[PDB]
Design a protein around this ligand. Structure first.
Ligand SMILES: [Cu+]
Ligand SMILES: [Cu+]
Ligand SMILES: [Cu+]
Ligand SMILES: [Cu+]
Lengths: 273, 73
């Protein structure tokens, strides 16, 4: 139950994480996480119902979505937990993250195809099935569409925002959640998806295993924010159309509320917080 | 008001847009797009990267596709 910085994993831990992810792909379970996510990407809108993104529930929805995925990994290998990618620190293509023993590198310039690591199409082990772009190979263009990941000073500016979220509780909001998500301000989470490129820049972004490591670090930033602001908590707290209030349940699970997900320690701890 | 319609060949491909609340096509295949509260647009193949107009979202999708047929959403 401890989530570790990707940069600190041992060779054995890297091996076991890759093997568990590849087994979930082989069995057909992985692709249904990709499909769930795309359905919510395409339905969450600023003027209508919004649950997984562009809304206060972006953070608890991804916390539970990651917990679903980690649980599925642990059904293959109980030793595995999701590692996190601190992109403010590991900000170049020569991060061991992108080594052939972990996620593989950037895509070639012709067609963006990833050519090394365990998820390269050439292995036969990572077909892209849930897709919109018709190609069936994993693609990336690290640093192609935006030339820099967020920096720690940028992260710090966002962590300093005391209000969790503000009306109208969407992509136009001020406050912490939308600055972390990235639709306003210096842009943390959205920019990272743009920086990786390939399927990570699309609605089928969980096609790239780095999705999980990116969201595990966004999830850690929510935990850090909570520590910086013990007097701040999830909002809204009741009666808000189209938005998940603190004590309302969330789709797709229907049985869990943001309130049940604010304290990550019920589920996991970080190597350091 | 929704944006105006458009029709052009961009990088060899036909992109079309029309109010519906807005629809975009790449070579006759519908592309999911979405408008943000601030008036910017994204599509499902560039969904973390707001651009100012639906044509810009269509063009971003053609850039993303690198010649690949779009699949119907
Ligand atoms: Cu998401
Ligand atoms: Cu969308
Ligand atoms: Cu994301
Ligand atoms: Cu204090």
């Amino acid at each position: 139950t401890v989530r570790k910085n990707q940069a600190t994993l041992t060779a054995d831990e890297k091996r076991r994480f890759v093997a568990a992810v590849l087994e979930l792909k082989r069995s057909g379970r992985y692709d249904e996480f990709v499909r769930t996510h795309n359905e919510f990407i395409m339905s969450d809108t600023d003027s209508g119902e919004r649950t997984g993104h562009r809304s206060p529930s972006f953070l608890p929805w991804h916390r539970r979505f990651l917990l679903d995925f980690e649980q599925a990994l642990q059904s293959v290998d109980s030793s595995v937990t999701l590692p996190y990618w601190d992109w403010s620190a590991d900000r170049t293509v020569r991060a061991s993250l992108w080594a052939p023993d972990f996620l593989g590198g950037t895509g070639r310039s012709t067609d963006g195809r990833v050519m090394d690591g365990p998820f390269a199409a050439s292995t036969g082990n990572w077909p892209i099935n849930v897709r919109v772009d018709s190609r069936t190979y994993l693609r990336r263009s690290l640093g192609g569409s935006v030339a820099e990941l967020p920096t720690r000073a940028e992260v710090e500016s966002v962590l300093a925002i005391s209000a969790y979220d503000l009306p109208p509780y969407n992509s136009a909001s001020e406050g912490f959640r939308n600055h972390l998500e990235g639709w306003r301000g210096v842009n943390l989470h959205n920019r990272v998806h743009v920086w990786v490129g390939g399927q990570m820049a699309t609605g089928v972004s969980p096609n790239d295993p780095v999705f999980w490591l990116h969201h595990a670090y966004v999830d850690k930033l929510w935990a850090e924010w909570q520590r910086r602001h013990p007097d701040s908590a999830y909002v809204p707290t009741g009666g808000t159309p189209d938005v998940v209030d603190l004590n309302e349940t969330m789709k797709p699970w229907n049985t869990v509320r943001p309130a049940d997900l604010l304290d990550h320690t019920a589920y996991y701890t970080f190597d350091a917080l | 008001a929704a944006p105006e319609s458009f029709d052009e060949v961009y990088k060899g491909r036909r992109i079309q847009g029309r109010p519906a609340g807005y629809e975009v096509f790449v070579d006759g295949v519908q592309l999911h797009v979405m408008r943000n509260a601030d008036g910017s647009w994204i599509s499902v193949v560039s969904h973390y990267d707001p651009v100012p107009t639906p044509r810009a979202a269509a063009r971003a999708a053609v850039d993303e596709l690198q010649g690949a047929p779009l699949l119907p959403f």
